[PDB]
Amino acid sequence: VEMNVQYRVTNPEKYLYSVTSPDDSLRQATDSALRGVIGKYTMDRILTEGRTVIRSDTQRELEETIRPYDMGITLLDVNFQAARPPEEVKAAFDDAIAARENEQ
């Protein structure tokens, strides 16, 4: 699973005289938030509903977790640039999905 974030600074002084090196904190907490959302849901559900159920939850969790650090950034949104859940090792459900048309 992969995603993408868009961020914006409101108060510069909190962006300077606080936790250092902003992109480090942003990315390196977003990973934890993404784990938090992706964890609880089953494989098929992640395959099917990847664009509705998970994204709002990752919004809420990431916005919550950036709060205590008291840094200054406001999130635009998070999007879903691409989805490739079947692992690259065995992305051979092309047989499994072409099976239904071959059956009909």
Binding site: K90, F93, D95, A96, A99, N102
Partner: protein, 56 residues
Amino acid sequence: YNRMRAEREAVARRHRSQGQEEAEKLRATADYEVTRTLAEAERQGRIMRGEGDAEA
């Protein structure tokens, strides 16, 4: 990884067999109809060959 693969190929071949089932099912009716019509034709042919033999 292999466990996933096994389950997934199992579902695939299940669909294979499920289709092939009624696929083979449907041919029996066609064979039945062709046999029946040929039998009727043979009956009529025998009748009129009998006509010919009797007059001879």
